[PDB]
DNA sequence: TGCATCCGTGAGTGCAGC
DNA sequence: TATAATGGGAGCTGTCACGGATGCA
């Protein structure tokens, strides 16, 4: 009545079914702003306080249609069988295989008919190298053993006489090699056939082109730059210590593990690509990559226009909670309000302390002049309590117990009966429940227990107090083990025909 | 409405971890602990205080309370000072802070994810003297111990290591809380062992065993008397509110008299005793009566020695002993004469 | 605003009563 | 202290009438 809370609501807050909000810090649920004394469910309080997120399963063998760190819109399919129900930043969870594209910059020669060759100072990927009217046989200018290295498209030949390479030839698309790996070739025998138009592969680009005119032919010394992929398999007990698209060098570790011999170390300069994640995590969040030391750590809560990283350069866009990613080297803010919404008699006691009695009396007085009969009625019923407290000098918050009194022991005896056996009052068992639950609560607090546990404990504590003061008033009555008999609480002691008044007071 | 149902719902909220999620969480926890130790090495501060600060900022200011082990009272002021001192460290050092925070968060998520196991284990401990919810909570304490003690390096799943500590906590709770008169855990073990022994013995004997048979089955060191006394100390109290008769109007405690407070007869008898003794007081002289009252403790309630009454009256202890003797003697004569103090001797 | 409707609270005394 | 173990279990029925709240039509 005092706080204007229906029985169901007060039940929900005291017994931890629902949160109630104090100093909302401008939260928003479904488009409507949040103001004090609003009733929030568990999902609502979690979405508001901890932000909105979800994770989706990826069936075996299937890869991602999206990339790590990439913003996503609701409805956008992350996989063929996966569609995100929300909008935000997708993140990879437990990638099964890591592909490394290794950077290789080398030098390789080729010889072509002068009429066919299209002269250029460099060749971009896919760009036509030459146009040949008739089939042409590229021949070896050295003797030795052939090392054939085949890319996705295009090939490399390396002639080594001594095991020391004496030649490197480049074979762009359109040249079918006539030699196998490890074949012995003499000078002037065809290593390839060129047909029609020959062009650069998509994998390899030609950075520099030198050309020596000799007779009717040109010899192109090509300075080439290309990437060679290598796949690595990641087991469930292994973690990826490297971010998506990270430049790595020989000796650095891409993926750690339990034991050093199963580790993945980078053999050569290359870029890292994370493929086939176990699951994909869609979060509503704002990403803030950083090039230097970060001013805020993980777990800190921050408003828009706040310092994040790089000595005050990159700042906060939205409201949220700070997750600092060292792996991806990015400060990620999951969007969440700072809203304070409590549960139980602590919240209620707070609201009670925050009641200004005179003010509410004025409110109800102004309410008493309303034409509606029901409103005048309820305002009268409320003003009766308000004025009761006002006239009495009792503080409303005293209806909440910080310190639960303990009856003198002689009034709840532990007594040795005739046979030396002990008999005792139920109040002792009630008090013991209370003290056990309270102590466990203090230990669970001091040890930093998760919220579900503390919530359960608090609920149990309230119910314990209930059982002590009035047993069976709310919920199932507390009974002793191996008996259906309700324990006798203080209320029971007082009232009824067997109660203190009628039994021991009005008669003796 | 139903607290168990409600809790099972709140538990049903957090989804079960996969192998990878579990491994990653455990790993982050462990590395977080390592990072806290590193921060202790660097800062030269207390690892526990650092842990409490990191956990404070992770959980937020919603929960801050003095830790029994901590030296300083933990308040937003001190945690802000320590946090800022942690913000004061170089990039590679400041890194360990982020590792720690991530560790704490991983810990919380790990426990919250594994809360179902505790329930599934605790459901089988009912009827042992603790409520279902209590068993669940103690089991949760066990779960926390298991989380902080876990090693992902062993490659064992979390449930295996958790179950041990969970059962441990539940059983410790049952042994500690279940009796109105508390009994030590080793003694509870002995009592339960005695029970199981007697039950097996009765299962093969087709009847309840005697003390001697139980003593035989318990081994050396155990005789009939030991079994009997062990069963005696094991006896639990009975309720004073235990109903008597088929109606609701009679409590068992209504038949139990108060032996402590003196009866009107006893009080009156002590009163007449004091009054009569004072008669004989006026009887003996002031000195001998006072010596007797001092030595027997009628004055301050304590019984003075001979040297005290002797130094008080200014005579030798031999003298005061002698006047005590003659006092008692005159009292004996007068008592034989009037037979007044005889009836108070029962 | 009037009327279902649900919940909570009562239902003699003294004897004895295991 | 480490195989793995991941959402409970018992319900209680043959009053009876009133005051007072609360809700829904």
Automatic annotation (TrEMBL), chain B:
<feature type="binding site">
    <location>
        <position position="219"/>
    </location>
    <ligand>
        <name>Mg(2+) 3</name>
    </ligand>
</feature>
<feature type="binding site">
    <location>
        <position position="219"/>
    </location>
    <ligand>
        <name>Mg(2+) 4</name>
    </ligand>
</feature>
<feature type="binding site">
    <location>
        <position position="215"/>
    </location>
    <ligand>
        <name>Mg(2+) 3</name>
    </ligand>
</feature>
<dbReference type="GO" id="GO:0005737">
    <property type="term" value="C:cytoplasm"/>
</dbReference>
<keyword id="KW-0805">Transcription regulation</keyword>
<feature type="binding site">
    <location>
        <position position="72"/>
    </location>
    <ligand>
        <name>Mg(2+) 1</name>
    </ligand>
</feature>
<keyword id="KW-0238">DNA-binding</keyword>
<feature type="binding site">
    <location>
        <position position="222"/>
    </location>
    <ligand>
        <name>Mg(2+) 7</name>
    </ligand>
</feature>
<feature type="binding site">
    <location>
        <position position="343"/>
    </location>
    <ligand>
        <name>Mg(2+) 11</name>
    </ligand>
</feature>
<dbReference type="GO" id="GO:0046872">
    <property type="term" value="F:metal ion binding"/>
</dbReference>
<keyword id="KW-0804">Transcription</keyword>
<feature type="binding site">
    <location>
        <position position="222"/>
    </location>
    <ligand>
        <name>Mg(2+) 8</name>
    </ligand>
</feature>
<feature type="binding site">
    <location>
        <position position="246"/>
    </location>
    <ligand>
        <name>Mg(2+) 9</name>
    </ligand>
</feature>
<feature type="binding site">
    <location>
        <position position="222"/>
    </location>
    <ligand>
        <name>Mg(2+) 4</name>
    </ligand>
</feature>
<feature type="binding site">
    <location>
        <position position="215"/>
    </location>
    <ligand>
        <name>Mg(2+) 4</name>
    </ligand>
</feature>
<dbReference type="GO" id="GO:0003677">
    <property type="term" value="F:DNA binding"/>
</dbReference>
<dbReference type="GO" id="GO:0016987">
    <property type="term" value="F:sigma factor activity"/>
</dbReference>
<dbReference type="GO" id="GO:0006352">
    <property type="term" value="P:DNA-templated transcription initiation"/>
</dbReference>
<feature type="binding site">
    <location>
        <position position="215"/>
    </location>
    <ligand>
        <name>Mg(2+) 5</name>
    </ligand>
</feature>
<feature type="binding site">
    <location>
        <position position="222"/>
    </location>
    <ligand>
        <name>Mg(2+) 5</name>
    </ligand>
</feature>
<feature type="binding site">
    <location>
        <position position="219"/>
    </location>
    <ligand>
        <name>Mg(2+) 7</name>
    </ligand>
</feature>
<comment type="subunit">
    <text>Interacts transiently with the RNA polymerase catalytic core.</text>
</comment>
<keyword id="KW-0963">Cytoplasm</keyword>
<feature type="binding site">
    <location>
        <position position="88"/>
    </location>
    <ligand>
        <name>Mg(2+) 2</name>
    </ligand>
</feature>
<comment type="similarity">
    <text>Belongs to the sigma-70 factor family. RpoD/SigA subfamily.</text>
</comment>
<comment type="function">
    <text>Sigma factors are initiation factors that promote the attachment of RNA polymerase to specific initiation sites and are then released. This sigma factor is the primary sigma factor during exponential growth.</text>
</comment>
<keyword id="KW-0731">Sigma factor</keyword>
<keyword id="KW-0479">Metal-binding</keyword>
<feature type="binding site">
    <location>
        <position position="249"/>
    </location>
    <ligand>
        <name>Mg(2+) 10</name>
    </ligand>
</feature>
<feature type="short sequence motif" description="Interaction with polymerase core subunit RpoC">
    <location>
        <begin position="134"/>
        <end position="137"/>
    </location>
</feature>
<feature type="binding site">
    <location>
        <position position="340"/>
    </location>
    <ligand>
        <name>Mg(2+) 11</name>
    </ligand>
</feature>
<protein>
    <recommendedName>
        <fullName>RNA polymerase sigma factor SigA</fullName>
    </recommendedName>
</protein>
<feature type="region of interest" description="Sigma-70 factor domain-2">
    <location>
        <begin position="110"/>
        <end position="180"/>
    </location>
</feature>
<feature type="binding site">
    <location>
        <position position="219"/>
    </location>
    <ligand>
        <name>Mg(2+) 6</name>
    </ligand>
</feature>
<feature type="domain" description="RNA polymerase sigma-70">
    <location>
        <begin position="305"/>
        <end position="331"/>
    </location>
</feature>
<feature type="DNA-binding region" description="H-T-H motif">
    <location>
        <begin position="306"/>
        <end position="325"/>
    </location>
</feature>
């Amino acid at each position: 009545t005092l706080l204007d809370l229906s029985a169901t609501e007060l039940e929900q807050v005291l017994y931890f079914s629902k949160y109630i909000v104090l100093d909302p810090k401008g939260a928003i649920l479904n488009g409507v702003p949040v103001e004090k004394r609003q009733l929030l469910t568990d999902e609502e309080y979690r979405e508001l306080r901890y932000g909105k997120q979800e994770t989706y399963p990826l069936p075996p063998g299937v890869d991602a249609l999206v990339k790590d760190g990439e913003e996503v819109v609701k409805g956008q399919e992350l996989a063929p069988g996966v569609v995100s129900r929300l909008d935000g930043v997708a993140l990879y969870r437990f990638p099964r295989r890591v592909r490394v594209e290794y950077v290789k910059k080398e030098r390789a020669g080729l010889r072509l008919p002068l009429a066919a060759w299209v002269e250029k100072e460099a060749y971009k990927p896919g760009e036509i190298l030459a146009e040949l009217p008739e089939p042409y046989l590229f021949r070896a200018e050295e003797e030795g053993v052939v090392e054939l290295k085949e890319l996705e498209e295009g090939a490399f030949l390396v002639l080594r006489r001594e095991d020391e390479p004496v030649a490197t030839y480049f074979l762009p698309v359109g040249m079918t090699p006539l030699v196998v790996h490890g074949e012995i070739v003499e000078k002037g025998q065809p290593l390839a056939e060129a047909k029609g138009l020959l062009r650069m592969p998509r994998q390899v680009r030609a950075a520099q082109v030198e050309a020596e005119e000799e007779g009717e032919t040109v010899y192109l010394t090509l300075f080439l730059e290309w990437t060679e992929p290598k796949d690595y398999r990641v087991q469930p007990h292994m973690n990826v210590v490297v971010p998506e698209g990270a430049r790595v060098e020989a000796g650095d570790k891409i993926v750690a593990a339990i034991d050093p011999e199963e580790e993945v170390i980078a053999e050569a300069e290359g870029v890292v690509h994370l493929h086939e994640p176990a699951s994909i995590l869609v979060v509503k969040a704002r990403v803030y990559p950083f090039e230097d030391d970060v001013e805020v750590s993980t777990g800190d809560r921050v408003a828009p226009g706040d310092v994040l990283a790089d000595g005050g350069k990159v700042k906060s866009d939205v409201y949220g909670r700070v997750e600092v990613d060292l792996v991806r080297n990015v400060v990620r803010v999951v969007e969440s309000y700072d809203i304070d919404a409590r549960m139980g008699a602590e919240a209620i006691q707070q609201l009670l302390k925050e009641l200004d009695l005179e003010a509410l009396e004025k409110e109800l007085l102004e309410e008493m002049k309303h034409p509606s009969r029901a409103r005048r009625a309820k305002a009268r019923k409320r003003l009766e309590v308000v004025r009761a407290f006002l006239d009495s000098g009792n503080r409303p918050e005293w209806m909440i117990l910080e310190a639960v009194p303990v009856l003198p022991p002689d009034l709840r005896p532990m007594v040795q009966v005739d046979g030396g056996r002990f008999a005792t009052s139920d109040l002792n068992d009630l008090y013991r429940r209370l003290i056990n639950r309270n102590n466990r609560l203090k230990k669970l607090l001091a040890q930093g227990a998760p919220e579900i546990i503390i919530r359960n404990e608090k609920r149990m504590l309230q119910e314990a107090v209930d059982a002590l003061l009035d047993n069976g008033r709310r919920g199932a009555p507390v009974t002793n083990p191996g008996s259906d008999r309700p324990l006798r609480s203080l209320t029971d002691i007082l009232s009824g025909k067997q109660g203190r008044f009628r039994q021991n007071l009005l008669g003796k | 409405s139903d607290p168990v149902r409600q809790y099972l719902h709140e538990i049903g909220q957090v989804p079960l971890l996969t192998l990878e999620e579990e491994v990653e969480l455990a790993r982050k926890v462990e590395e977080g602990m390592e990072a806290i130790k590193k921060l202790s090495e660097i800062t030269g501060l207390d690892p526990d205080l650092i842990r409490e600060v990191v956990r404070a900022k992770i959980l937020g200011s919603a929960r801050v309370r003095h830790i029994p082990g901590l030296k300083e009272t933990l308040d937003p002021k001190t945690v802000e000072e320590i946090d800022q001192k942690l913000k004061s460290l170089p990039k590679e050092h400041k890194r360990y802070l982020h590792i720690a925070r991530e560790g704490e968060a991983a810990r919380q998520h790990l426990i919250e994810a594994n809360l179902r196991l505790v329930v599934s284990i605790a459901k089988k401990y009912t009827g042992r003297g603790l409520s279902f919810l209590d068993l669940i909570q103690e089991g949760n304490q066990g779960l926390i111990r298991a989380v902080e003690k876990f090693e992902y390096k062993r490659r064992f799943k979390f449930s295996t290591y958790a179950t041990w500590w969970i059962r441990q906590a539940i059983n410790r709770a049952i042994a500690d809380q279940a009796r109105t008169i508390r009994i030590p855990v080793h003694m509870v073990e002995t009592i339960n062992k005695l029970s199981r022994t007697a039950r097996q013995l009765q299962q093969e004997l087709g009847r309840e065993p005697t003390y001697e048979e139980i003593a035989e089955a318990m081994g050396p060191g155990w005789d009939a008397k030991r079994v009997e006394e062990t069963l005696k100390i094991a006896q639990e109290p009975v309720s004073l509110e235990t109903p008597i008769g088929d109606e609701k109007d009679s409590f068992y405690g209504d038949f139990i008299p108060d032996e402590h407070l003196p009866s009107p007869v006893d009080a009156a008898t002590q009163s007449l005793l004091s009054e009569e003794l004072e008669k004989a007081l006026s009887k003996l002289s002031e000195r001998e009566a006072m010596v007797l009252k001092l030595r027997k403790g009628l004055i301050d309630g304590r019984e003075h020695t001979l040297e005290e009454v002797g130094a008080f009256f200014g005579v030798t202890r031999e003298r005061i002993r002698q006047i005590e003797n003659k006092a008692l003697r005159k009292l004996k004569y007068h008592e034989s004469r009037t037979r007044k103090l005889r009836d108070f001797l029962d």
